Structures are given as structure tokens and as C-alpha cells.
Scaffold this motif. Structure first.
Motif, PDB file in Angstrom:
ATOM      1  N   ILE A  93       2.505   8.321   8.118  1.00 48.44           N
ATOM      2  CA  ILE A  93       1.911   6.991   8.007  1.00 48.44           C
ATOM      3  C   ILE A  93       2.762   5.982   8.776  1.00 48.44           C
ATOM      4  O   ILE A  93       3.952   5.825   8.498  1.00 48.44           O
ATOM      5  CB  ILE A  93       1.772   6.554   6.525  1.00 48.44           C
ATOM      6  CG1 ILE A  93       0.970   7.592   5.730  1.00 48.44           C
ATOM      7  CG2 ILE A  93       1.121   5.178   6.428  1.00 48.44           C
ATOM      8  CD1 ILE A  93       1.194   7.542   4.230  1.00 48.44           C
ATOM      9  N   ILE A  94       2.147   5.305   9.742  1.00 47.08           N
ATOM     10  CA  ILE A  94       2.861   4.344  10.585  1.00 47.08           C
ATOM     11  C   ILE A  94       2.278   2.934  10.484  1.00 47.08           C
ATOM     12  O   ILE A  94       1.140   2.686  10.896  1.00 47.08           O
ATOM     13  CB  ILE A  94       2.904   4.796  12.069  1.00 47.08           C
ATOM     14  CG1 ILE A  94       3.497   6.206  12.188  1.00 47.08           C
ATOM     15  CG2 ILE A  94       3.703   3.798  12.912  1.00 47.08           C
ATOM     16  CD1 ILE A  94       3.206   6.907  13.502  1.00 47.08           C
ATOM     17  N   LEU A 152       5.604  11.273   5.324  1.00 44.72           N
ATOM     18  CA  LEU A 152       6.527  10.449   6.100  1.00 44.72           C
ATOM     19  C   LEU A 152       5.942   9.071   6.390  1.00 44.72           C
ATOM     20  O   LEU A 152       4.870   8.952   6.984  1.00 44.72           O
ATOM     21  CB  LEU A 152       6.913  11.159   7.404  1.00 44.72           C
ATOM     22  CG  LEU A 152       8.012  10.569   8.296  1.00 44.72           C
ATOM     23  CD1 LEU A 152       9.295  10.254   7.525  1.00 44.72           C
ATOM     24  CD2 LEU A 152       8.303  11.514   9.451  1.00 44.72           C
ATOM     25  N   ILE A 153       6.658   8.036   5.960  1.00 41.81           N
ATOM     26  CA  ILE A 153       6.225   6.661   6.171  1.00 41.81           C
ATOM     27  C   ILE A 153       7.164   5.923   7.126  1.00 41.81           C
ATOM     28  O   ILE A 153       8.360   5.789   6.864  1.00 41.81           O
ATOM     29  CB  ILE A 153       6.074   5.881   4.832  1.00 41.81           C
ATOM     30  CG1 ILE A 153       5.148   6.634   3.869  1.00 41.81           C
ATOM     31  CG2 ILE A 153       5.557   4.459   5.088  1.00 41.81           C
ATOM     32  CD1 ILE A 153       5.040   6.021   2.481  1.00 41.81           C
ATOM     33  N   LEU A 213       0.814  -1.209   0.000  1.00 38.54           N
ATOM     34  CA  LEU A 213       0.000   0.000   0.000  1.00 38.54           C
ATOM     35  C   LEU A 213       0.856   1.271   0.000  1.00 38.54           C
ATOM     36  O   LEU A 213       0.536   2.239  -0.692  1.00 38.54           O
ATOM     37  CB  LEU A 213      -0.937  -0.014   1.213  1.00 38.54           C
ATOM     38  CG  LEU A 213      -2.176   0.882   1.224  1.00 38.54           C
ATOM     39  CD1 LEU A 213      -3.074   0.604   0.023  1.00 38.54           C
ATOM     40  CD2 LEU A 213      -2.945   0.696   2.525  1.00 38.54           C
ATOM     41  N   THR A 214       1.944   1.253   0.767  1.00 38.95           N
ATOM     42  CA  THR A 214       2.852   2.397   0.860  1.00 38.95           C
ATOM     43  C   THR A 214       3.767   2.514  -0.361  1.00 38.95           C
ATOM     44  O   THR A 214       4.318   3.584  -0.631  1.00 38.95           O
ATOM     45  CB  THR A 214       3.701   2.356   2.157  1.00 38.95           C
ATOM     46  OG1 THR A 214       4.475   1.151   2.194  1.00 38.95           O
ATOM     47  CG2 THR A 214       2.808   2.418   3.387  1.00 38.95           C
ATOM     48  N   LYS A 215       3.916   1.413  -1.097  1.00 33.86           N
ATOM     49  CA  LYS A 215       4.726   1.387  -2.319  1.00 33.86           C
ATOM     50  C   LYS A 215       4.027   2.025  -3.520  1.00 33.86           C
ATOM     51  O   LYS A 215       4.683   2.400  -4.490  1.00 33.86           O
ATOM     52  CB  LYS A 215       5.154  -0.040  -2.659  1.00 33.86           C
ATOM     53  CG  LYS A 215       6.313  -0.555  -1.828  1.00 33.86           C
ATOM     54  CD  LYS A 215       6.607  -2.010  -2.144  1.00 33.86           C
ATOM     55  CE  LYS A 215       7.644  -2.582  -1.192  1.00 33.86           C
ATOM     56  NZ  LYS A 215       7.779  -4.054  -1.365  1.00 33.86           N
ATOM     57  N   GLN A 240       8.745  14.040  -2.381  1.00 33.01           N
ATOM     58  CA  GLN A 240       7.577  14.172  -1.504  1.00 33.01           C
ATOM     59  C   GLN A 240       7.512  13.109  -0.407  1.00 33.01           C
ATOM     60  O   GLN A 240       6.926  13.341   0.653  1.00 33.01           O
ATOM     61  CB  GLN A 240       6.276  14.150  -2.320  1.00 33.01           C
ATOM     62  CG  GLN A 240       6.182  15.203  -3.424  1.00 33.01           C
ATOM     63  CD  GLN A 240       6.249  16.629  -2.904  1.00 33.01           C
ATOM     64  OE1 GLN A 240       5.454  17.031  -2.052  1.00 33.01           O
ATOM     65  NE2 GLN A 240       7.195  17.403  -3.423  1.00 33.01           N
ATOM     66  N   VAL A 241       8.112  11.948  -0.666  1.00 30.23           N
ATOM     67  CA  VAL A 241       7.991  10.797   0.228  1.00 30.23           C
ATOM     68  C   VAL A 241       9.327  10.402   0.860  1.00 30.23           C
ATOM     69  O   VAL A 241      10.326  10.206   0.163  1.00 30.23           O
ATOM     70  CB  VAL A 241       7.372   9.569  -0.500  1.00 30.23           C
ATOM     71  CG1 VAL A 241       7.042   8.462   0.489  1.00 30.23           C
ATOM     72  CG2 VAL A 241       6.119   9.969  -1.273  1.00 30.23           C
ATOM     73  N   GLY A 242       9.328  10.304   2.187  1.00 27.80           N
ATOM     74  CA  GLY A 242      10.461   9.777   2.943  1.00 27.80           C
ATOM     75  C   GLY A 242      10.022   8.536   3.692  1.00 27.80           C
ATOM     76  O   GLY A 242       8.968   8.530   4.335  1.00 27.80           O
ATOM     77  N   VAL A 243      10.825   7.479   3.605  1.00 33.93           N
ATOM     78  CA  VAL A 243      10.462   6.185   4.184  1.00 33.93           C
ATOM     79  C   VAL A 243      11.529   5.670   5.149  1.00 33.93           C
ATOM     80  O   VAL A 243      12.702   5.545   4.785  1.00 33.93           O
ATOM     81  CB  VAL A 243      10.182   5.126   3.075  1.00 33.93           C
ATOM     82  CG1 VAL A 243       9.986   3.736   3.672  1.00 33.93           C
ATOM     83  CG2 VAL A 243       8.964   5.520   2.251  1.00 33.93           C
TER      84      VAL A 243
END
Ligand SMILES: Nc1ncnc2c1ncn2[C@@H]1O[C@H](COP(=O)(O)OP(=O)(O)OP(=O)(O)O)[C@@H](O)[C@H]1O
Ligand SMILES: Nc1ncnc2c1ncn2[C@@H]1O[C@H](COP(=O)(O)OP(=O)(O)OP(=O)(O)O)[C@@H](O)[C@H]1O
Ligand SMILES: [Mg+2]
Ligand SMILES: [Mg+2]
Lengths: 241, 241
Positions: free
Chosen positions: A192-193, A161-162, A45-47, A78-81
Motif C-alpha cells: 500500500i503506497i 507493506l505500507i 485508513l492505514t491505521k 503482519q503489518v510493516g510501515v
């Protein structure tokens, strides 16, 4: 501000359906928790938020922009994981935290380390922030590495942030510091956690419960416990049995 | 059958003292939980049981044998460790589990996978145990990968089994399955469990509380919880609220 519309995903044209007709709206400033059995689709889902993969059906949108027709480079920023495991480079702790932006001085380095709960143990090392970490990653302990990784991800400063099981190996006190600071961390951004430890996401604005690729249940921690026969209740009551 | 006498350890002659004056006896067949803050010395303690490093004072003995005289081939067969993160080889699931003893009967592989709680998801795959896993480690999920790794270690069949945060990223159901199987996992062997989730080590024969490289507390779940000023009680109270 982040939208999943009629999402259907599988990995290969032969693969079974991994994400099945998922619909979700995550508005900016929200702490979202994602829980569920091992293999239910939480990471997949986060991918799609990162567009490592494209759905066969539906749309992913950020701020009204369809990711399928969005700029590739724009989306990366935009996305940091933060993952479960993190290799640190064979250089100093300060250098490791400042990876995304050197020239940023010692104070915003320390603030990032203070937010991650790393500043205490770094100050008590003899070499301090100038301590050169391992040629493999771990000249420190697992949790120390993981807190440096969190500090770096905050410096990176993404609008999304994931956390993917980022704190699940940290002790309760260590995780508490990070979760206590969640009010400052998610200011003007989405967090998102994904958690195996349910207590991590207890204070999320929305908790999403995944099962066999579907969002099966939803709500706040107390709202999910209102139904004793719910999947969330079953997992919760397994805390000590 | 595992003894630490007057152990003093540091990593380098330059390094500060990690473990100080630790004395510990673990009899054959017991299940021992180790808890404490990130950086308290949990992983280090288990590193000396494999002799990755050697103390400056004190002795480590296994079954009465001082590790300064132990056969390195013998010791590796004696101690099996499952870590937080595990790499699988780019081949079939059964080849991954069987690594240590290939040509072994198929029902022993399946039995190990059942104890790990992996059999159910593996069987539901199109290719079953013959499924070639990640061209990296995983075209599987993190928790699926982790349960394969647990199964692999059970097949290695060591006399001492160390879980270092092995279950901390597993959902409550998957972990509960493993812990319910613990009575079969530790048949004729000793099991050491390092966990951040204090519920994981609830039913352990003995719980060891680490703090700044020393064993500060030691006992059974409720005996430690009964102490008004103990660290174990403080750490547990951080779980529920
Ligand atoms: N690269 C891949 N190729 C094919 N299938 C995959 C791949 N990665 C994951 N899967 C499958 O997709 C499903 C969900 O995987 P995912 O990693 O999203 O679950 P998860 O909830 O993150 O699991 P965990 O809680 O164990 O991390 C599983 O059935 C898994 O086997
Ligand atoms: N390879 C190493 N070289 C030098 N120092 C180390 C090494 N590994 C750990 N340390 C240091 O030794 C201390 C204890 O480390 P250890 O990994 O045993 O803690 P831990 O309890 O396992 O922590 P965590 O729960 O975060 O894994 C820490 O202060 C750490 O910085
Ligand atoms: Mg996952
Ligand atoms: Mg450790």
C-alpha cells in the motif's frame, strides 16, 4: 484478502467523522496507491489496518479474520510501515538493516539494500556496511537514511507493506529503482503506497482517490484520466502549471 | 547578497570532501531551486548558510558579511529553515505560529497561514486557531502540520527562507497554493528551494543542479531543458516516463 466493510471512524466521541462508510477489498499481491488532498484520511485508513484504533461502525478483515476479535500480537507481525521520517539507531548500517533478524547473513542484507537502492552508496563509503550512523540518525543525508529504512522494512518482511510518503523526498532515479523493484517486493504480499507525487503510483493495480474521508474515485491511472473533470485529473494537470 | 567563494567542505578531518570548489552568487529577492540525486550535497550547501559547520577553504558571505565574523544571534534571525519533518509544541495553533513574536496582531498570523494554505483547514476546525495540536506534534495530519510549520517560518520573517523538501509530501493542490503565493512570500527576501519534484522549482529565477558535491549545471527551467545531454533534462524525462 484485506476487507473494509461499512467503516465509520472518528478519533474522539466528539470528533467529526474521519472515515465515512468506506468499502474496499484489497487482494493479496496487489500494489494499491492512495492519493488525495492533505487531510483527506489516507493515513487514518492505514491505521485501522494496524488497529491502533477501532471503528464505531463496520469491520476490518485480513484473510477473513475480523481484526476486532483477532490476536493483538499476530496483527503486529503482519503489518510493516515505512513513514516519511525515520530515526536510525546509533550503530552500523548493516546492524540497522538487520534489526529484525541478525544471523541473517551479508547476502540477504545486501539484497535488501539492492532492492531499496542503497547498496551503491554504502559500497563507496570508506567503512562500508560497517559505517556507524549518527547519534541522532543523520550521519548521512535524508534520502540515504530513508533508503536504509526501506531496506530494513524489507528485511522485517511483513505480509502487508505500507509506504506512507516513503519515497516522496527521494529523487526520481532513486524512487524509480524502488518502483522498478516493486514486482519482486510485493511477491506473495500486499503493498500500500500513499503518495503526494502521483507518478509514484502510476503502475499500481488500483489507485484509490480519497476526499473528505470517502473513496471518491477509483481505477487504474489511465482509467482515472478518462474523466477530465475527475479529482485525479485535476491534481494530475497541476503537475507543471 | 549570498556568495560562496572557492568553497571546500568536509564534515570531519577524517571525512571525505563533500563540497568541492563551489562558486555561487544569489542576489537579493531571487527564488532559487536546487536539484540533484540523493546525497549530492543539497542539504550540506544550505548548512553553510547557517554556519552549522565551517569550510577549510573559501568563504561564505551574506550581504557582504563574511560568516567568520557574523553575530550568531543575527544570523539565526536572517536564515529561517523549513525542513521535511517539523515538530509542533503541545499547545494552540496560534501559539505554534506566533512562537517567535507572541503578542503580534492576529491578522498577521492569519495572513501567514493563508500564504501557507493553512487558513482554510484551521478555520474548519471546531476550535479554530485555539485548537491544541498533537499531544506529540499532531492530532493533525502530516501535511496540516507541515503547512503550520511553513506559516510559522513566514512569521519569523527571515531575510533568507530555505525550503528543504518542505513541500515534497504535500499534495499537488496544497503545493500549487504555496507556489502561487511565492511572489508574496519572497517580497524583500531571498528564497531557496530544495525539491525532488522538479515541477516545484519550475518558475524559479535560477535552477542549480548538484552532482557529487559540485554545481554541474545552472540556469533557467527551459534553458537547462534545451540541453540534449544535460542532467536536468535527463531527470525531467524521468518524470513523464
Ligand atoms: N490524532 C488525531 N486526532 C484527531 N484528529 C486527527 C488525528 N490525526 C488526524 N486527524 C484528522 O483526521 C483527518 C485526516 O487525517 P489523515 O492524517 O488521515 O489525513 P492524510 O490524508 O494522511 O493527510 P496528509 O496527506 O496531510 O498526510 C484530518 O482532518 C486530521 O485533522
Ligand atoms: N552530518 C554528516 N556527517 C557526515 N557526512 C554527512 C553528514 N550529512 C551528510 N553527509 C554526507 O555528505 C554527502 C551529502 O549529503 P547531503 O545531505 O548534502 O545530500 P543531499 O543532496 O541533501 O541528499 P538528500 O537529497 O538525500 O537529502 C552524502 O554523501 C552524505 O553521506
Ligand atoms: Mg498523512
Ligand atoms: Mg537533503
Amino acid at each position: 484478502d484485506i476487507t473494509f466493510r461499512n467503516i465509520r471512524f472518528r478519533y474522539k466521541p466528539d470528533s467529526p467523522v474521519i472515515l465515512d462508510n468506506i468499502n474496499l477489498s484489497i487482494k493479496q499481491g496487489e500494489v494499491i496507491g492512495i492519493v488525495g488532498r492533505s487531510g483527506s484520511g489516507k493515513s487514518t485508513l492505514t491505521k485501522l489496518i494496524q488497529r491502533f484504533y477501532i471503528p464505531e461502525n463496520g469491520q476490518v478483515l485480513i484473510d477473513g479474520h475480523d481484526l476486532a476479535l483477532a490476536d493483538p500480537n499476530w496483527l503486529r507481525r503482519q503489518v510493516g510501515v515505512v513513514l516519511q521520517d525515520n530515526v536510525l539507531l546509533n550503530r552500523s548500517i548493516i546492524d540497522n538493516i538487520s534489526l529484525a533478524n541478525p544471523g541473517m547473513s551479508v547476502e540477504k542484507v545486501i539484497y535488501a539494500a539492492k532492492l531499496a537502492g542503497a547498496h551503491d552508496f554504502i559500497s563507496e563509503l570508506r567503512e562500508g556496511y560497517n559505517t556507524i550512523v549518527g547519534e541522532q540518525g543523520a550521519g548521512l543525508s535524508g534520502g540515504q537514511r530513508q533508503r536504509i529504512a526501506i531496506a530494513r522494512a524489507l528485511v522485517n518482511n511483513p505480509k502487508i507493506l505500507i509506504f506512507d510518503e516513503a519515497t516522496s523526498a527521494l529523487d526520481y532515479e532513486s524512487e524509480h529503482v524502488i518502483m522498478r523493484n516493486m514486482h519482486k517486493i510485493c511477491k506473495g504480499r500486499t503493498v500500500i503506497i500513499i503518495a503526494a507525487r502521483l507518478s509514484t503510483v502510476k503502475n499500481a493495480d488500483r489507485i484509490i482517490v480519497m476526499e473528505k474521508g470517502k473513496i471518491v474515485e477509483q481505477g487504474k491511472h489511465k482509467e482515472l484520466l478518462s474523466e477530465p473533470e475527475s479529482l485525479y485529473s485535476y491534481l494530475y494537470q497541476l503537475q507543471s502549471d
